Amino acid sequence: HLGKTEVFLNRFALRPLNPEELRPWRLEVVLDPPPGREEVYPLLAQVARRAGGVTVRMGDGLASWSPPEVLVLEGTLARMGQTYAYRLYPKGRRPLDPKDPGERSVLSALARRLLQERLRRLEGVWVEGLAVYRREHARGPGWRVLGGAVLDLWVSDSGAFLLEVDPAYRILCEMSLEAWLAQGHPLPKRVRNAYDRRTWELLRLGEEDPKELPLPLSLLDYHASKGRLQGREGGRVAWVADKPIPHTGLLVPVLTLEDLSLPWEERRRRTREIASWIGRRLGLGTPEAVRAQAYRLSIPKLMGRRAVSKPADALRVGFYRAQETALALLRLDGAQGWPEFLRRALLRAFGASGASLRLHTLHAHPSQGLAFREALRKAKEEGVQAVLVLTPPMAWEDRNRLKALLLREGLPSQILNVPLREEERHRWENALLGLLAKAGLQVVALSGAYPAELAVGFDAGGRESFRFGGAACAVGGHLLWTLPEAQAGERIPQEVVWDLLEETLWAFRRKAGRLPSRVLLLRDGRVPQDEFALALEALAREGIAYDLVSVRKSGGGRVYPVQGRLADGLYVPLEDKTFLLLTVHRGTPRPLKLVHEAGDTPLEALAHQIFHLTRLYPASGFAFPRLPAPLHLADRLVKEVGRLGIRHLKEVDREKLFFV
DNA sequence: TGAGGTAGTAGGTTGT
RNA sequence: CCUACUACCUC
Ligand SMILES: [Mg+2]
Ligand SMILES: [Mg+2]
Ligand SMILES: [Mg+2]
Questions:
Q1: Is there contact between A638 and strand C, defined as CB under 7 Å from any strand atom?
Q2: Residue A383: which region, alpha, beta or left (left: phi > 0; alpha: psi -120 to 50)?
Q3: Catalytic annotation present for A524
Q4: Do A305 and A198 form a contact (C-beta atoms < 8 A)?
Q5: Same structural domain, A496 and A635
Q6: Is A8 helix (H, G, I), strand (E, B) or coil?
Q7: Among candidates A35, A206, A26, A185, which has minimal Cα distance to A110?
Q8: Which ligand sits nearest to residue A467's alpha carbon?
Q9: Residue A246 is part of a domain; what is its CATH number?
Q10: Which nucleotide lies nearest residue A459, CA to C1'?
Q11: Closest CA to A247 of A302, A298, A208
């Protein structure tokens, strides 16, 4: 199993803190008028920033790595109107212990402030936050592309600086939203006001006069009175958007699509060079790239009717559990009837599978109106389970409407763009897999022994002020989804998690004849304090064992091999109850960083299962998703519900995956 | 709307 | 940490 290797990650070990840095200067803060119980953290922190030097926040005070005699121990900070005045008092020096978690926390704070305060005063270039840009990758007429490392410098257990490096580019332009438009470039989709820092969604140009424009004063007079039209020359009008709003000599463009990924090996090179450079110029010593041992993991045994290397091959071999089913066709283009090949391809797959299938054809059209909805009612009534939609590229709005309409009839839909050709294999072969998943068929499954019988993933909606908390089970070592719950933010209500979970327990109970022994709980991103409290409590009582795991996409940094190829499916244990995974294999892989939040399973065992769940995804076809099937499924569910409403999911079978 | 990835651009979860 | 969108590559 454990085909052990050794690969170092994009971190670096540097000189151990000196005695002085272990004894930071302590200061006291006297801000009058006294802040509100609620207005402290953001204020008390902007006071340190104001105080100058490498100083951070120290609980109810400040802590510095700079002699008080070079700080601004008096001044006045302003936050949200009120102008409170501050006053620092030098109050000794307390020794800090890196061995302690709580103490080390502030030292690492100072260390980041150090890195920022010392990088800013280099003859180099910009320093946008944690970022740094040495050279220039390109300098076209109107745009400039500078390249950089994004950095972080913290303190370890032993008390030595740790410097994490990761190369990154930046697209910055000089020309105005007018000189750039006159230079001969199409209208951007994003603009940022040059008096402020707020941005807009540039909709069009205004066929109106600046001076004679009626504002809610005079348009050209507004920006004039505010002294914004000095040293410049406002051009023509422009309808920005949040309902339009007048605004082009004052606006600036946000370049993105207009006007290259770093090669895998050519990235680790620039990573070390930037390190040698940041330690040499900052007097932090010779960077010792931190290496770690990895483990090649067991290959997944994905199996249709017969074992298979990828879900797409399940089309010529057969499905894992194909039941009798009938699909439908909806052409929003000209012609009628299934294309010859899409039919041959389906009958073969269902031939192999052994189940019988009947292709239908909807002789209706959306434009008919309600006549159209009954065309569906009749289709469903005749036994149709899912419908393939051949239509030229639709608009987002028209797309959701049609999707939502069919769902209101209990018919998931897989869209496929009419400009189609037989030799576009991957295209329509995936279209079929996606249709079939939506129909309720289990394309492939996993052969093997896994610690948990049930695997559920939780995520959170998007868009509008509110989100949708949602989860989706995976019965036995078939997949299904549950009815989501609209919530205020990203934290999922404690009893909402439980109820969502309970549904998957009971789903499993329906499939097997018994409650699960053990469940694998996968939360997308960080797991807000105690959002799984009520959940894990219950599982305990009900005598079913568990494992919670933060699956984080960002923050896994990089991981390069000491020498040779980078193997697919590396298990890279890090600290305690936390490890990496490079679950996939053009650019440079971004490893997932998992964190065992509760349970007693060996990390090696979790990593194994998690990695295997990767290949369980139905509409994947010729490539597997980066995270586990359940977590990836919860993502899309949550996404589509938030996209086109929860109101439609009412009459939709939970075993049908409409969101894929 | 074939799907997966990584790579940009914004804006901003939770709990400092 | 996450929520989106856009562009390139790949089967
Ligand atoms: Mg999330
Ligand atoms: Mg997500
Ligand atoms: Mg799909």
A1: yes
A2: left
A3: yes
A4: no
A5: yes
A6: strand
A7: A26
A8: 1
A9: 2.170.260.50
A10: C2
A11: A208
